[PDB]
Amino acid sequence: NPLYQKHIISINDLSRDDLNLVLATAAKLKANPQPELLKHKVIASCFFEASTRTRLSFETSMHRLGASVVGFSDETLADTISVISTYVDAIVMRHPQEGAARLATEFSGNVPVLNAGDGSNQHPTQTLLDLFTIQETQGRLDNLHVAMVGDLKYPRTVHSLTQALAKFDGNRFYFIAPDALAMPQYILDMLDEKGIAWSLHSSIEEVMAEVDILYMTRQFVLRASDLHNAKANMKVLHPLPRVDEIATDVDKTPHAWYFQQAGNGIFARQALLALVLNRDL
Amino acid sequence: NPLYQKHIISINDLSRDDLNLVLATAAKLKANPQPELLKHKVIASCFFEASTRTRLSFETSMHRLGASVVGFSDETLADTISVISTYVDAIVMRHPQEGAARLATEFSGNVPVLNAGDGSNQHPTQTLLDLFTIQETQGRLDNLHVAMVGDLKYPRTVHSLTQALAKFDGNRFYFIAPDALAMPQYILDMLDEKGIAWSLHSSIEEVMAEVDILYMTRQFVLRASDLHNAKANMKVLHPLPRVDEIATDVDKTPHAWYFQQAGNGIFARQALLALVLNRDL
Amino acid sequence: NPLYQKHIISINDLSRDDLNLVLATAAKLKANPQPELLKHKVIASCFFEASTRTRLSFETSMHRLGASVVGFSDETLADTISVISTYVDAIVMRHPQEGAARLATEFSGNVPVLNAGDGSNQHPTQTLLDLFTIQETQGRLDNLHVAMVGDLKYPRTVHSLTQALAKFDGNRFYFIAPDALAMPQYILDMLDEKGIAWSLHSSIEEVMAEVDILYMTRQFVLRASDLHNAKANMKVLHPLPRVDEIATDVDKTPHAWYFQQAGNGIFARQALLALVLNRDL
């Protein structure tokens, strides 16, 4: 385990075999729970910025491993972290300002900080549950067709997911975005200087028949109507919440997988906690 | 156990032997606690509408059975329930809108929802602790005199309690209410088409000497002064909170039982949880 | 154990050997944790007045002893305590009004109340962690030089700490305060009618070379610059939060001990809980 007592601010600061080990740990915890693994551990859920579904999933992941939780669903932040790091074995925090988790690392001492949302920048466990659901549904993170639909400019979870998928071989991307919203040039360059296929589009039915994963973000409104030529294995993903970015008539379909996607966050965060605060596996 | 993995929205959707089994389970848990019964269970306390005494009693009931709690004391509600039902083993929820728990049932999947307050309509565990305290104080839920004083029009817990008491034999009711407030006609008809005694009144001392239970609701202000001709077994009940509906000079008396009544909610909710998420007893 | 099932409103209602037993229990729990000591115990963290660092430390102390926590980080208070005392084994409460904990004692029955902040008056566990850190750093609570700098008029934790230190022998105090702020006359009289040394001052470097403990409160701004003639064992203490009462350039120094001080609150509150809800040690 390379992650024992590691801070986790950015998923991009991670190797591909690190991702594979995290996903394997998550699958092992999904198969047979280990509810006393993190017994006698006390973790802080410090949601400076409220996020009740992220917080509920994180705390349920902690409780599945028999840990205890203290925190707040809400002086400098430096002093707050300096004090809290003397109570707990780990700090899980969400903060409305960018770089706040990396700042917390400098005063947390021998206590690892896990980023649950750092401004609207890093949110690694969301990308981890995304990758875990992709691997869980397709059995592989290699040789896959990944359509990404919506606002691909601002939500950096999309960029983190693309960078994680590029660390595996054989994938082809499809970017559906108006124009003002579009995958920034640096990820296109990251795929070019790594030799990976990708193509912009205007609508979803343009390549509906070819996609393995359809990842949507928060005009381009999806409907079950538009899933006639879908591959049987195809899965629809959404980090949530949704309104009518995905109309409710898609929930009934076999491709609707955003609720199972959100449920897999339990195992992503469970595996991350287990890797950080435990050596043996 | 007929209640294993059952939703509990309304107490009226329950047989009399169901009530007897719940009360027996509550008495058994009151006698010798079983603190590992619901070990490895994770329950959501989703108080969309704040209710800290109901929530504290519910969560203490969960912790008495060794369970773990995640939630919020506070996108559609449908998506919220759809996501949360993938984290937890049961959902205990209070919501300010009527029918919200029944709505949550349609997306909770294999996860039972327990209504902790659904608008100002159903609140089954309050009626359950009421019945449990009546059975605990009088040793029987049959052949009893039940005075019900105050606003008997709007709080539907009164109607649920009357319907539950009518499922047992031999009771006589006394309804003390101004005029604009009065037990709605449908419960009077429920008692008529079941042959049960009941009588309206204007004051409490009119039949103070005859009552076994004096249940008060939220001009008709009670005082210890008015308890001279009380039966020795008589018990005063109030779902709480009170102000001077019950003056403080009654707290000292042996008939004051609303605090023990509220304390019995621990065992009512403990028994309900044990019945839902466990088969063997 | 004289404290079994005792209310703890004021630290001044305590003997010196009581303090020594509490500190010994805290050191024993710091040495080898006893995480199942208060198993099957349920405690209420009733923070009527929000105090997230006091609350987080209290709840972490509860969880270190394997207890479970219910409460609120926020009808009369009398009825609230009367109801809550039927759920839980102990009540830890902070309330914005003076004497609220002593009031809660009158309705808590066989449930001990532990004061986590009673108005801006009593806050015994803060004084307990102060004494524990002094004993931990100097190895003794006797024959020590204690400088107390800042507003020594209003924060009654300073008065409680001075009264606790006066219950031991051989200490000399130094009071640094503007003029409008100054240690009230009654503590000066408490030291006079007990024969203990103390001296007022105008600045810190006046007796910087002689002090064992430098306790600061919430013009008199400290800097690392002013620690050249410090004793090697000297420790800087602050109940927190701080702004520039202690400039950040002191954090690096070996005398900075306010974060370790706050961390010792875990063990102070752990020991208090263990003493109250347990007989054997």
Side-chain angles (χ1 to χ4, degrees):
Chain A
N1 185 357
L3 299 180
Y4 181 68
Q5 301 280 300
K6 248 67 186 198
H7 304 333
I8 298 145
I9 313 306
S10 209
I11 178 155
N12 313 344
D13 290 49
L14 220 62
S15 85
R16 77 284 328 280
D17 300 77
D18 294 331
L19 300 170
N20 271 327
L21 174 60
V22 174
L23 292 214
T25 326
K28 195 223 183 194
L29 291 175
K30 184 174 176 163
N32 44 317
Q34 316 200 212
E36 313 275 30
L37 171 51
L38 296 185
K39 199 192 179 86
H40 310 316
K41 261 45 200 142
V42 177
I43 306 155
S45 100
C46 298
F47 278 71
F48 301 86
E49 180 198 15
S51 174
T52 52
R53 45 173 310 271
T54 309
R55 180 185 65 87
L56 274 206
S57 149
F58 260 107
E59 294 183 1
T60 298
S61 303
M62 309 191 234
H63 278 119
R64 287 295 188 206
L65 303 171
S68 306
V69 188
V70 297
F72 47 92
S73 175
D74 203 344
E75 175 165 27
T76 52
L77 168 79
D79 295 3
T80 301
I81 292 297
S82 303
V83 172
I84 278 179
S85 43
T86 81
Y87 304 169
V88 298
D89 300 315
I91 290 167
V92 169
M93 64 178 292
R94 195 196 193 86
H95 202 285
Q97 290 185 354
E98 190 206 39
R102 202 225 90 262
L103 171 58
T105 64
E106 312 194 311
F107 313 96
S108 75
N110 262 66
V111 190
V113 172
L114 292 81
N115 183 17
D118 170 76
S120 268
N121 184 19
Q122 304 306 299
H123 191 355
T125 38
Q126 184 63 36
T127 302
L128 277 182
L129 69 89
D130 292 344
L131 294 167
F132 179 81
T133 322
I134 294 176
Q135 182 203 61
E136 162 97 36
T137 48
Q138 327 293 64
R140 64 192 204 251
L141 295 154
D142 319 59
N143 322 95
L144 287 169
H145 302 262
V146 198
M148 293 180 179
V149 189
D151 170 27
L152 302 94
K153 198 190 226 207
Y154 300 106
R156 252 158 315 177
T157 45
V158 199
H159 316 341
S160 273
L161 177 57
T162 302
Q163 293 180 45
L165 292 165
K167 301 186 191 193
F168 296 75
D169 294 279
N171 300 325
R172 171 176 169 189
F173 296 86
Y174 308 82
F175 296 151
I176 298 97
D179 253 330
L181 320 170
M183 201 92 191
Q185 186 79 231
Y186 73 96
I187 317 104
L188 330 170
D189 305 357
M190 182 245 187
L191 300 161
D192 289 327
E193 70 202 35
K194 273 153 92 114
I196 319 197
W198 58 271
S199 48
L200 277 69
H201 291 270
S202 60
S203 147
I204 297 82
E205 195 226 357
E206 266 184 53
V207 291
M208 250 309 306
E210 282 182 282
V211 307
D212 292 283
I213 300 284
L214 185 81
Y215 195 93
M216 310 213 57
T217 55
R218 225 177 309 146
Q219 321 277 357
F220 285 27
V221 153
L222 194 77
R223 281 162 193 109
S225 209
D226 303 359
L227 302 184
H228 43 72
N229 51 331
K231 313 216 305 200
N233 69 292
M234 194 278 274
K235 290 300 175 248
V236 182
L237 267 59
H238 198 299
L240 295 173
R242 63 102 180 273
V243 289
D244 273 280
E245 308 156 351
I246 294 167
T248 62
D249 69 318
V250 183
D251 316 330
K252 303 169 56 160
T253 69
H255 306 305
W257 214 254
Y258 38 85
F259 291 147
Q260 295 92 344
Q261 179 196 357
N264 276 346
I266 299 308
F267 302 121
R269 285 142 179 157
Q270 219 172 320
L272 204 67
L273 285 174
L275 293 189
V276 171
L277 309 148
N278 214 271
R279 292 178 66 86
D280 58 302
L281 307 91
Chain B
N1 185 357
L3 299 180
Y4 181 68
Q5 301 280 300
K6 248 67 186 198
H7 304 333
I8 298 145
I9 313 306
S10 209
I11 178 155
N12 313 344
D13 290 49
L14 220 62
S15 85
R16 77 284 328 280
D17 300 77
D18 294 331
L19 300 170
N20 271 327
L21 174 60
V22 174
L23 292 214
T25 326
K28 195 223 183 194
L29 291 175
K30 184 174 176 163
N32 44 317
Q34 316 200 212
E36 313 275 30
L37 171 51
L38 296 185
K39 199 192 179 86
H40 310 316
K41 261 45 200 142
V42 177
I43 306 155
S45 100
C46 298
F47 278 71
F48 301 86
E49 180 198 15
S51 174
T52 52
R53 45 173 310 271
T54 309
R55 180 185 65 87
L56 274 206
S57 149
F58 260 107
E59 294 183 1
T60 298
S61 303
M62 309 191 234
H63 278 119
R64 287 295 188 206
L65 303 171
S68 306
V69 188
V70 297
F72 47 92
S73 175
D74 203 344
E75 175 165 27
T76 52
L77 168 79
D79 295 3
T80 301
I81 292 297
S82 303
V83 172
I84 278 179
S85 43
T86 81
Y87 304 169
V88 298
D89 300 315
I91 290 167
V92 169
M93 64 178 292
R94 195 196 193 86
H95 202 285
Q97 290 185 354
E98 190 206 39
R102 202 225 90 262
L103 171 58
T105 64
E106 312 194 311
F107 313 96
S108 75
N110 262 66
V111 190
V113 172
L114 292 81
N115 183 17
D118 170 76
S120 268
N121 184 19
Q122 304 306 299
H123 191 355
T125 38
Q126 184 63 36
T127 302
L128 277 182
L129 69 89
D130 292 344
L131 294 167
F132 179 81
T133 322
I134 294 176
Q135 182 203 61
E136 162 97 36
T137 48
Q138 327 293 64
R140 64 192 204 251
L141 295 154
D142 319 59
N143 322 95
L144 287 169
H145 302 262
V146 198
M148 293 180 179
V149 189
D151 170 27
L152 302 94
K153 198 190 226 207
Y154 300 106
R156 252 158 315 177
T157 45
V158 199
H159 316 341
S160 273
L161 177 57
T162 302
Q163 293 180 45
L165 292 165
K167 301 185 191 193
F168 296 75
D169 294 278
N171 300 325
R172 171 176 169 189
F173 296 86
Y174 308 82
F175 296 151
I176 298 97
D179 253 330
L181 320 170
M183 201 92 191
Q185 186 79 231
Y186 73 96
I187 317 104
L188 330 170
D189 305 356
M190 182 245 187
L191 300 161
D192 289 327
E193 70 202 35
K194 273 153 92 114
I196 319 197
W198 58 271
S199 48
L200 277 69
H201 291 270
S202 60
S203 147
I204 297 82
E205 195 226 357
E206 266 184 53
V207 291
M208 250 309 306
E210 282 182 282
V211 307
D212 292 283
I213 300 284
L214 185 81
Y215 195 93
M216 310 213 57
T217 55
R218 225 177 309 146
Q219 321 277 357
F220 285 27
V221 153
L222 194 77
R223 281 162 193 109
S225 209
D226 303 359
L227 302 184
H228 43 72
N229 51 331
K231 313 216 305 200
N233 69 292
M234 194 278 274
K235 290 300 175 248
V236 182
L237 267 59
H238 198 299
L240 295 173
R242 63 102 180 273
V243 289
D244 273 280
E245 308 156 351
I246 294 167
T248 62
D249 69 318
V250 183
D251 316 330
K252 303 168 56 160
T253 69
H255 306 305
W257 214 254
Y258 38 85
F259 291 147
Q260 295 92 344
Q261 179 196 357
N264 276 346
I266 299 308
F267 302 121
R269 285 142 179 157
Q270 219 172 320
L272 204 67
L273 285 174
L275 293 189
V276 171
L277 309 148
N278 214 271
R279 292 178 66 86
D280 58 302
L281 307 91
Chain C
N1 185 357
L3 299 180
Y4 181 68
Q5 301 280 300
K6 248 67 186 198
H7 304 333
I8 298 145
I9 313 306
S10 209
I11 178 155
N12 313 344
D13 290 49
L14 220 62
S15 85
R16 77 284 328 280
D17 300 77
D18 294 331
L19 300 170
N20 271 327
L21 174 60
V22 174
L23 292 214
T25 326
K28 195 223 183 194
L29 291 175
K30 184 174 176 163
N32 44 317
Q34 316 200 212
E36 313 275 30
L37 171 51
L38 296 185
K39 199 192 179 86
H40 310 316
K41 261 45 200 142
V42 177
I43 306 155
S45 100
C46 298
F47 278 71
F48 301 86
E49 180 198 15
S51 174
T52 52
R53 45 173 310 271
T54 309
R55 180 185 65 87
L56 274 206
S57 149
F58 260 107
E59 294 183 1
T60 298
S61 303
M62 309 191 234
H63 278 119
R64 287 295 188 206
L65 303 171
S68 306
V69 188
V70 297
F72 47 92
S73 175
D74 203 344
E75 175 165 27
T76 52
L77 168 79
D79 295 3
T80 301
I81 292 297
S82 303
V83 172
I84 278 179
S85 43
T86 81
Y87 304 169
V88 298
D89 300 315
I91 290 167
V92 169
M93 64 178 292
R94 195 196 193 86
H95 202 285
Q97 290 185 354
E98 190 206 39
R102 202 225 90 262
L103 171 58
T105 64
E106 312 194 311
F107 313 96
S108 75
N110 262 66
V111 190
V113 172
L114 292 81
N115 183 17
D118 170 76
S120 268
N121 184 19
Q122 304 306 299
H123 191 355
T125 38
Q126 184 63 36
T127 302
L128 277 182
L129 69 89
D130 292 344
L131 294 167
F132 179 81
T133 322
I134 294 176
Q135 182 203 61
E136 162 97 36
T137 48
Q138 327 293 64
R140 64 192 204 251
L141 295 154
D142 319 59
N143 322 95
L144 287 169
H145 302 262
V146 198
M148 293 180 179
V149 189
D151 170 27
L152 302 94
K153 198 190 226 207
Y154 300 106
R156 252 158 315 177
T157 45
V158 199
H159 316 341
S160 273
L161 177 57
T162 302
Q163 293 180 45
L165 292 165
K167 301 185 191 193
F168 296 75
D169 294 278
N171 300 325
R172 171 176 169 189
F173 296 86
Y174 308 82
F175 296 151
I176 298 97
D179 253 330
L181 320 170
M183 201 92 191
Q185 186 79 231
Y186 73 96
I187 317 104
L188 330 170
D189 305 356
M190 182 245 187
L191 300 161
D192 289 327
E193 70 202 35
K194 273 153 92 114
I196 319 197
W198 58 271
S199 48
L200 277 69
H201 291 270
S202 60
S203 147
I204 297 82
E205 195 226 357
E206 266 184 53
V207 291
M208 250 309 306
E210 282 182 282
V211 307
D212 292 283
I213 300 284
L214 185 81
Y215 195 93
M216 310 213 57
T217 55
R218 225 177 309 146
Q219 321 277 357
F220 285 27
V221 153
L222 194 77
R223 281 162 193 109
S225 209
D226 303 359
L227 302 184
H228 43 72
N229 51 331
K231 313 216 305 200
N233 69 292
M234 194 278 274
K235 290 300 175 248
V236 182
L237 267 59
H238 198 299
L240 295 173
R242 63 102 180 273
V243 289
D244 273 280
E245 308 156 351
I246 294 167
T248 62
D249 69 318
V250 183
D251 316 330
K252 303 168 56 160
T253 69
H255 306 305
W257 214 254
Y258 38 85
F259 291 147
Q260 295 92 344
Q261 179 196 357
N264 276 346
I266 299 308
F267 302 121
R269 285 142 179 157
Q270 219 172 320
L272 204 67
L273 285 174
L275 293 189
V276 171
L277 309 148
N278 214 271
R279 292 178 66 86
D280 58 302
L281 307 91

